[PDB]
Amino acid sequence: PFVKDFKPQALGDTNLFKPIKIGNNELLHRAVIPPLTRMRAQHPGNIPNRDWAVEYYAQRAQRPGTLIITEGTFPSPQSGGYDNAPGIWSEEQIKEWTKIFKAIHENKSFAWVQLWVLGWAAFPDTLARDGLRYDSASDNVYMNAEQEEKAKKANNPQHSITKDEIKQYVKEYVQAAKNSIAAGADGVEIHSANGYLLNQFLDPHSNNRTDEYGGSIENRARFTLEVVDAVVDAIGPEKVGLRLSPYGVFNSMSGGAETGIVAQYAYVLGELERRAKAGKRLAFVHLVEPRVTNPFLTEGEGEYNGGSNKFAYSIWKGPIIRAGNFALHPEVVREEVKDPRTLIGYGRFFISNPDLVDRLEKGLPLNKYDRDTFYKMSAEGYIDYPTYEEALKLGW
């Protein structure tokens, strides 16, 4: 149905509908589709859906000039450990991705591939089946009790990756980024957020290393920056973004409870801005807001109000995409887009509204999302969500 308790507000008069250049692409609007894992990829081979996926992304590219960041996508088998999430290392997978970008391109929109590495959020048993390691920053601290048990009982205990394995990960990022461009993607986003491998190095709870990859702000950041640096060198700074969740606690990150957390993220942006002034500026930085610390909780819940992402604007001088509970709060978006380098990711409501942008322009009602079909091998809750035209014909 439509959302019942929502008072919509037309946003067409704001900067949300002013064009902006991000990297090589000329966006005609600032409503961004953030990366959204959907678990329709096919097992075996982590293959993008050959029946639904082209249609999923086409539908959501229907407004011209939309930046679309794809779901998390694995650079390598060892990066993985979810059967139904996609990859970009094989010919099989690339062939399907080529078609998905083509469809986005035809709707006059853009496609950036999110390069996803799981670390300790992977399923240790799924990885053991395929004889792969269950990796993280350290081996003496675990995501949760469930995962510790799964890992021991599959004889696949958490491994603290060596320097050579870190290099290997970096090669796989580079190759995965090249593959994305060759297949026709506009750029890539490096997932350094939401408690996945790179975030596990950034955060001091998950990272108990005393080597060059832990034990200080500089060291916790070295991996995230090694990957950014090598991907930029491979494909160019204007085809590279980076996602961070400074106040995230998903997958057992510290959030605001950790007093050094702002400093950790301020250092990373600082270093991005240092590369920028020396002549290699990332296309964007993408921040998860403290408005949403866990995206599987309803809007309003898991909200940290002890901290703000405003510090980022003092440090990083380029485009900033912000995401978390903006669909139900046009009044907040109205104030954030008064800043002329601020874009807004809308996650969950872009799952349920293929024409979300039209609805934001003219203040239309929003389609309600079905949490139970977020992660499910089904057309339903995926490509059968209606446009406002089609929704009136059904009587909502």
DSSP letter assigned to residue 373: G
Q: Which amino acid appears at position 144 of this protein?
A: N
The angle, 0 to 180 degrees and rounded to 10, between the axes of the packed helices 217-235 and 163-182 is 30
Nearer to ligand FMN, 142 or 196 (CB): 196
Using the minimum distance from each CB to ligand FMN, give the nearer residue, 68 or 232. 68
Q: Bin 176: left if φ > 0, else alpha if -120 < ψ < 50, else beta.
A: alpha
Tell the smallest beta-carbon distance from residue 240 to ligand FMN (Å).
15
- Write out the two tokens for 148: 């510790």
C-beta of 160 vs 252, nearer to ligand FMN: 252
Distance, in Å, from the CA atom of 93 to the CA atom of 113, rounded to the nearest integer, reads 13
If DSSP codes are grouped into helix, strand and coil, which group holds residue 147?
Answer: helix
**Residue of this chain nearest to ligand FMN (CB atom):** 347
Residue 114 or 264: which CB sits closer to ligand FMN? 114
CA–CA distance, 324 with 304 (Å, rounded to integer): 12
Closest distance to ligand FMN from the beta carbon of 277 (Å) = 27
Closer to ligand FMN by CB, 220 or 243: give it. Answer: 243
Spot the catalytic one: 56, 82, 196, 369.
Answer: 196
Whole-angstrom CA distances from 35 to 115, 144, 345 are 10, 25, 9
How far is it, in rounded angstroms, from Cα 326 to Cα 16?
12
Half-sphere exposure of 383 (CA within 13 A, CB side): 14
Residue with tokens 């139900």: 328
Q: Give me the least distance between CB of 157 and ligand FMN, in Å please.
A: 26
Query: What CA–CA distance (Å, rounded) separates 243 from 265?
Result: 11
**At its nearest, how many Å lie between ligand FMN and the CB of residue 346?**
5
Judged by CB, which is closer to ligand FMN: 154, or 377? 377
Least gap, CB of 31 to ligand FMN (angstroms)? 11
Structure tokens given for 145 = 């009790």
Comparison of 37 and 78: residue with beta carbon closer to ligand FMN? 37
Separation CA 314–CA 203 (nearest Å): 22
Assess whether 134 carries a catalytic annotation. Answer: no
What is the smallest separation between the CB atom of 225 and ligand FMN, expressed in angstroms?
19
Rounded distance between C-alpha atoms, residue 314 and residue 293, angstroms: 22
Q: Kindly state the helix (H) or strand (E) to which residue 27 belongs, with its residue range.
A: strand 25-27
CA distance 340 to 338: 6
Question: Is the peptide bond between 44 and the residue preceding it cis, with omega within 30 degrees of 0?
Answer: yes
Chain residues binding ligand FMN by CB under 6 A are: 34-37, 71-72, 114, 191, 193-194, 243, 288, 292, 295, 323-327, 346-348, 374
- Residues 6 or more apart whose CB falls under 8 angstroms from that of 324 comprise 288, 289, 290, 291, 292, 347
Give the shortest CB-102-to-ligand FMN separation in angstroms: 22
- Give the Cβ contact number of residue 329 at 10 Å: 15
- Residues serving a catalytic function are 196
